[PDB]
Amino acid sequence: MIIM
Amino acid sequence: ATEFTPSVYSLVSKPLPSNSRPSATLDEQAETEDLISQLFDLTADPNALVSEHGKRYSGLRKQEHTQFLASSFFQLPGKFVSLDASRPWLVFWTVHSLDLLGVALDQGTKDRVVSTLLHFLSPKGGFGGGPANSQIPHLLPTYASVCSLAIAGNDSSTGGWKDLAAARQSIYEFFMRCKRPDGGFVVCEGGEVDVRGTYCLLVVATLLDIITPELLHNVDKFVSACQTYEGGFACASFPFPSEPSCRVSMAEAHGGYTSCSLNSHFLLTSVPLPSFPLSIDANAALRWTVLQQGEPIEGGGFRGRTNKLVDGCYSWWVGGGAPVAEELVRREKSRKVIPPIFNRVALQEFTLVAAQQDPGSTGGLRDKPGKRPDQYHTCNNLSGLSIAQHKMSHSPSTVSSNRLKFDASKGLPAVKPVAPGGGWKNEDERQNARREIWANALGWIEEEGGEIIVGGKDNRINTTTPVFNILGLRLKPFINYFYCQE
Amino acid sequence: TYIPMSQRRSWADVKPIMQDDGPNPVVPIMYSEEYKDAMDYFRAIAAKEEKSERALELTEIIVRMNPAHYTVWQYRFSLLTSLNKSLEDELRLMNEFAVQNLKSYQVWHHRLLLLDRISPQDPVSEIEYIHGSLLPDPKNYHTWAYLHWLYSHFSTLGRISEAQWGSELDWCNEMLRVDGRNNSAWGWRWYLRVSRPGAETSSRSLQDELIYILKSIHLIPHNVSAWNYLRGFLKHFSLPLVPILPAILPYTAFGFPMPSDPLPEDTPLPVPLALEYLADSFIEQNRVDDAAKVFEKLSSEYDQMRAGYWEFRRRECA
Numbered sequence: 001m002i003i004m
Numbered sequence: 005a006t007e008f009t010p011s012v013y014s015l016v017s018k019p020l021p022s023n024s025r026p027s028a029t030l031d032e033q034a035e036t037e038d039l040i041s042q043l044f045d046l047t048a049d050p051n052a053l054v055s056e057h058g059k060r061y062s063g064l065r066k067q068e069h070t071q072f073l074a075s076s077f078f079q080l081p082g083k084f085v086s087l088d089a090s091r092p093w094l095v096f097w098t099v100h101s102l103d104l105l106g107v108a109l110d111q112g113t114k115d116r117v118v119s120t121l122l123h124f125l126s127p128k129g130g131f132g133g134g135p136a137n138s139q140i141p142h143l144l145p146t147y148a149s150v151c152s153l154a155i156a157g158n159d160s161s162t163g164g165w166k167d168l169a170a171a172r173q174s175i176y177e178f179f180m181r182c183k184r185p186d187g188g189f190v191v192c193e194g195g196e197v198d199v200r201g202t203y204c205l206l207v208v209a210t211l212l213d214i215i216t217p218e219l220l221h222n223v224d225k226f227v228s229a230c231q232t233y234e235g236g237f238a239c240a241s242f243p244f245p246s247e248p249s250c251r252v253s254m255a256e257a258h259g260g261y262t263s264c265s266l267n268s269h270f271l272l273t274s275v276p277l278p279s280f281p282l283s284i285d286a287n288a289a290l291r292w293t294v295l296q297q298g299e300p301i302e303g304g305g306f307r308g309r310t311n312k313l314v315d316g317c318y319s320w321w322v323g324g325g326a327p328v329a330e331e332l333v334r335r336e337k338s339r340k341v342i343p344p345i346f347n348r349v350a351l352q353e354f355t356l357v358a359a360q361q362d363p364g365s366t367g368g369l370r371d372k373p374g375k376r377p378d379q380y381h382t383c384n385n386l387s388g389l390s391i392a393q394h395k396m397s398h399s400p401s402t403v404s405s406n407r408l409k410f411d412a413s414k415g416l417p418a419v420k421p422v423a424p425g426g427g428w429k430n431e432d433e434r435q436n437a438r439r440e441i442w443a444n445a446l447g448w449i450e451e452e453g454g455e456i457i458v459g460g461k462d463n464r465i466n467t468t469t470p471v472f473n474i475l476g477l478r479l480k481p482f483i484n485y486f487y488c489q490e
Numbered sequence: 491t492y493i494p495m496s497q498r499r500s501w502a503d504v505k506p507i508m509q510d511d512g513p514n515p516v517v518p519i520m521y522s523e524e525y526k527d528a529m530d531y532f533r534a535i536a537a538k539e540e541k542s543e544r545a546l547e548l549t550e551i552i553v554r555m556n557p558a559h560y561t562v563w564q565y566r567f568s569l570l571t572s573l574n575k576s577l578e579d580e581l582r583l584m585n586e587f588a589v590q591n592l593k594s595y596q597v598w599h600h601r602l603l604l605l606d607r608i609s610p611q612d613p614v615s616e617i618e619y620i621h622g623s624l625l626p627d628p629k630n631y632h633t634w635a636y637l638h639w640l641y642s643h644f645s646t647l648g649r650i651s652e653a654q655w656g657s658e659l660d661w662c663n664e665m666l667r668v669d670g671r672n673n674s675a676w677g678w679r680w681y682l683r684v685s686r687p688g689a690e691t692s693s694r695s696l697q698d699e700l701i702y703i704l705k706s707i708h709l710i711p712h713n714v715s716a717w718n719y720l721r722g723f724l725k726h727f728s729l730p731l732v733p734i735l736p737a738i739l740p741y742t743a744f745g746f747p748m749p750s751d752p753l754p755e756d757t758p759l760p761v762p763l764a765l766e767y768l769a770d771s772f773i774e775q776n777r778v779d780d781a782a783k784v785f786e787k788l789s790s791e792y793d794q795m796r797a798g799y800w801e802f803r804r805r806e807c808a
């Protein structure tokens with residue numbers, strides 16, 4: 001879930 | 005409504021041809037084609053009138069997805085430490101998904117959401133990924149926190165919106181501290197510069213009535229120069245000095261950054277500044293968007309960039325960008341002087357057949373078969389599913405009706421710009437800006453008769469708004485609060 | 491077993507600060523004892539704005555447990571600059587992070603800040619490191635973005651020689667030889683050959699580029715990357731499509747590369763983007779009805795996933  | 009949206013089950017599935025030239029890309033592609041097509045083969049065609057015997061039923065397992073989101077909502081295992089700086093996103097993914105699934109939180113739980121997020125708000129401006137005593141503010145948690153407050157908050161003393169209104173000047177000052185002269189923003193102090201930050205900042209500034217000319221200077225140029233030769237948008241553009249002599253995109257067109265770029269640009273088109281925003285190539289963006297929808301053998305899901313794999317989260321990033329690209333293309337056609345632009349049926353089939361967790365397990369939606377579901381893919385699969393189910397367009401007559409009802413005499417205090425001449429020239433110009441920005445933010449409609457609910461009406465989820473990605477029934481009272489409209 | 495930091499002599503003077511979640515927070519994470527302890531003391535360190543070696547060590551401990559912790563990375567870089575630490579030693583640590591799987595938007599940005607501050611007169615060793623790092627994942631988006639930034643930043647300083655640019659194109663050509671479907675390497679070629687400010691634009695270079703593009707299409711006729719590059723190339727340089735049509739027409743069923751006379755095996759025809767090329771070339775010739783016919787076939791027969799888009803393009807012809 002790495003969007004930041 | 006389906007003449008030009010053929011079901012995946014109605015088309016011939018065939019592998020991407022090799023041309024007798026093997027490569028690592030093709031090995032992964034073929035393996036993924038096998039995985040998805042085998043699951044479709046095991047699943048009853050959702051368009052069939054009576055569900056077939058032995059096959060899996062593809063109906064949207066709304067209660068399983070609710071339970072998936074509930075269990076992670078009140079306690080996360082220690083492994084989620086890797087998302088400790090992303091907890092506002094965990095909130096947003098959860099509460100937007102529940103909105104889409106039509107599941108209400110009780111007031112006590114909503115109050116817990118509001119209180120958790122307000123503890124992430126720094127007095128100097130902005131939300132961080134965790135409590136203000138532990139994390140500095142960051143543009144991305146600020147978007148996720150603000151949107152989550154739109155979903156879970158209210159106008160009362162415990163509703164969070166009042167605190168947001170009081171934070172407008174400090175949030176604005178945080179945004180201005182993030183601003184680079186070339187039109188990019190750092191995501192946080194010392195942080196990276198890309199269109200994720202631009203998108204998150206512009207959404208929040210639009211919703212909270214804190215847009216100024218000085219905030220926006222060169223922001224359009226930074227985004228426009230992110231467009232690549234493929235027609236999508238890269239993460240960032242690089243400014244070469246002579247202000248800059250030229251700007252160059254820094255990587256591939258990607259669904260995530262194309263979503264942020266289209267949405268940012270769209271938000272800027274509401275702003276009444278001269279020769280602003282610098283144009284993009286809307287036709288090339290529309291072409292890139294539709295080219296990323298996968299073939300029937302890969303379930304009609306979207307990929308995020310050329311020659312990579314389909315992934316359910318791009319139902320939102322790429323699928324949700326389609327109405328925006330379509331509207332920008334419509335505007336250019338009208339400036340020079342209706343069939344669906346992507347396969348709305350196939351995208352729903354991908355969501356129902358491939359992106360749901362296998363039945364009777366943990367629930368949740370996922371990137372693709374073989375991947376564990378998580379909150380992020382649950383939210384983005386459902387957000388994209390909503391865009392596929394409901395024909396969203398930006399309605400000039402709706403914007404015109406919004407302009408007719410806008411009350412420019414109501415509003416919160418104007419922001420005080422950081423530079424003396426950085427605000428609007430006068431109240432005529434500022435109020436016209438407030439009217440245009442508010443009226444266009446509320447311009448998205450679901451087209452009557454445009455609904456396509458693959459698999460029957462029990463699969464229907466609520467309508468999300470393009471650009472913002474919250475339900476219209478959340479967006480309207482939220483932005484009305486901050487602009488003092490009613 | 492674990493030794494709490496309240497029991498450490500080096501830390502005995504620091505009163506930890508608890509996380510300020512409020513009464514009953516949503517999405518709470520059940521932190522390990524080690525992580526909670528380190529963050530309790532980081533909160534104390536950061537609140538007092540201590541810039542020290544123990545604070546530096548603490549930030550490493552935290553980003554090893556959570557590489558995405560942007561606040562701690564920000565503090566770590568401010569420590570490095572405050573303490574005048576060896577940024578070359580820090581780069582060596584960052585090589586290991588990506589090696590020990592520790593990666594993120596923050597690790598990559600930290601590396602960029604290091605390179606910006608070191609400001610090497612010659613960034614060749616970093617260029618070579620980045621090339622090597624692409625072996626496990628040759629499409630890693632942050633890495634390709636970082637490589638673009640590195641060449642762009644150091645070329646603005648005048649520090650990229652003609653030899654360096656030439657070896658970079660050699661490296662890019664080898665990447666596309668190993669996997670011509672690597673769209674990230676196609677994007678890099680576009681920077682090297684077209685978009686970067688120092689790129690040569692001559693009659694020779696346009697001819698060479700078109701040869702490379704067409705050779706690439708004939709090697710992999712269904713490679714979308716090569717087709718998009720061809721279309722971007724022609725559009726960018728305002729080159730007409732018709733003069734190249736001989737090399738494209740065999741896929742729609744002179745002096746530039748033509749398809750192999752027996753087309754490679756596993757090349758089913760028509761290639762939809764070849765039809766897109768043909769239709770756009772009809773539009774170039776104002777033969778709008780011949781273009782509409784090709785769009786209709788893409789819609790109804792040859793690219794039915796995009797039936798609606800191709801129908802839209804058909805209607806535009808009227």
Ligand SMILES: CC(C)=CCC/C(C)=C/CC/C(C)=C/CONC(=O)CP(=O)(O)O
Pocket residue numbers: 002003004144200203204258259260261264307308309312313315321630631632
């Ligand atoms: C509002 C926000 C935070 C938008 C972010 C949207 C996204 C998804 C941006 C993409 C980030 C990115 C390029 C990560 C790189 O690693 N991801 C992949 O490689 C996945 P793929 O193979 O599909 O490209």
Ligand SMILES: O=S(=O)(O)C[C@H](O)CNC1CCCCC1
Pocket residue numbers: 064065066067068069
């Ligand atoms: O798939 S979902 O709709 O989200 C939830 C499950 O179907 C629940 N199945 C129950 C089995 C026993 C009888 C009552 C229903």
Ligand SMILES: O=S(=O)(O)C[C@H](O)CNC1CCCCC1
Pocket residue numbers: 126127128129136137138139140532533536537561
């Ligand atoms: O008054 S404000 O500046 O708005 C908020 C306080 O400074 C909180 N600072 C935190 C200290 C620990 C590290 C993360 C930031």
Ligand SMILES: O=S(=O)(O)C[C@H](O)CNC1CCCCC1
Pocket residue numbers: 063459460461462463
């Ligand atoms: O409203 S309609 O589209 O005509 C038809 C219904 O929605 C069908 N929903 C199913 C009913 C039986 C249980 C599983 C779902």
Ligand SMILES: [Zn+2]
Pocket residue numbers: 315316317318371381
């Ligand atoms: Zn994904």
